[PDB]
């Protein structure tokens, strides 16, 4: 579903992805209501979306 309204990838993808844990930086005891996403859109996803 993150790859449904926001970003999936190009189908013939070249290059790659690097990810790592970020609990220390992008988290607070009070909560971060700053990173938000999309739940509703009319149509289906296709590669570039912003």
């Amino acid at each position: 579903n993150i790859a449904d309204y926001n970003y999936k990838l190009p189908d013939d993808f070249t290059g790659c992805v690097i990810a790592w844990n970020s609990n220390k930086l992008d988290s607070k005891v009070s909560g971060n209501y700053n990173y938000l996403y999309r739940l509703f859109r009319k149509s289906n996803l296709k590669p570039f979306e912003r």
């Epitope: 609990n23 005891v29 909560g31």
Partner: antibody, heavy 118, light 109 residues
Framework: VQLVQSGAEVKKPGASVKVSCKAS????????IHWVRQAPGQGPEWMAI????????SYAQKFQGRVTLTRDTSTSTLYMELSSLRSEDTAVYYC??????????????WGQGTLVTV | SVLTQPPSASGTPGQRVTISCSGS????????VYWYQQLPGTAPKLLIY???QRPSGVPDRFSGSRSGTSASLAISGLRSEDEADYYC?????????????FGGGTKLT
């Protein structure tokens, strides 16, 4: 520059028990507050971490939702209202101090604790 | 995870023994450890930071170190006053909960 607890006694199981300790000393808005529970004859379990000011709260897996905490700045009181007491909920509570704006690091000295039994 | 600890730590006055906490992956090898000593009848007191320096000041007869997924504390010059219970605390970061987990329980004799 110290924290002292409040007095309590044995209560009926399946009820609400009010627990509190004061806070005084340095500035208040930039020091996180830890509470931790310790059972006799065993190891202590971490209870909660609280940000003053906005009163941010976070709870562990074994106590998520079944315990309620409140906090304030001017009166400087720190309340929990325990509910659903078992024989497992007979232990001593401690209120602490942290580094400040960070929940990782060494723990500043605790109080004298509050003993609760059912 | 669970932070297994030996049930007791044998000792005699005037010698050196090591007390250790053995943990799982991403609990000891990831974050630092904290050693604690509980004197009877008193509130617990901090004794070490991350095991490279002393917090305020203690004689250097106690030495802490890490090895892989475990942490160890070597104590020497044992006295009858220091007979207490030792605990270790660490940030767990496990599945469904990431609290400040503690060890088991040991007794110094």
């Amino acid at each position: 520059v110290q924290l002292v607890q409040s007095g309590a006694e044995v209560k009926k199981p399946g009820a609400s028990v009010k627990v509190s300790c004061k806070a005084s000393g340095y500035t208040f808005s930039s020091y996180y507050i830890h509470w931790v529970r310790q059972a006799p004859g065993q190891g202590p379990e971490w209870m909660a971490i609280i940000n003053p000011g906005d009163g941010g709260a976070s709870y562990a897996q074994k106590f998520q939702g079944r315990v309620t905490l409140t906090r304030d700045t001017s009166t400087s009181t720190l309340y929990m209202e325990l509910s659903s007491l078992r024989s497992e909920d007979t232990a001593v509570y401690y209120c602490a101090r942290a580094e400040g704006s960070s929940w990782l690091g060494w723990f500043d000295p605790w109080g004298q604790g509050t003993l609760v039994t059912v | 995870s669970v932070l297994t600890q030996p049930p007791s730590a044998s000792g005699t006055p005037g010698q050196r023994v090591t007390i250790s906490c053995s943990g799982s992956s991403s609990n000891i090898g990831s974050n630092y450890v904290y050693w604690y000593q509980q004197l009877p009848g008193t509130a617990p007191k901090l004794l070490i930071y991350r095991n490279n320096q002393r917090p305020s000041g203690v004689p250097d007869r106690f030495s802490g170190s890490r090895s892989g997924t475990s942490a160890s504390l070597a104590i020497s010059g044992l006295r009858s006053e220091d007979e207490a219970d030792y605990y270790c605390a660490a940030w767990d970061d496990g599945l469904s909960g990431s609290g400040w987990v503690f060890g088991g329980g040991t007794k110094l004799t």
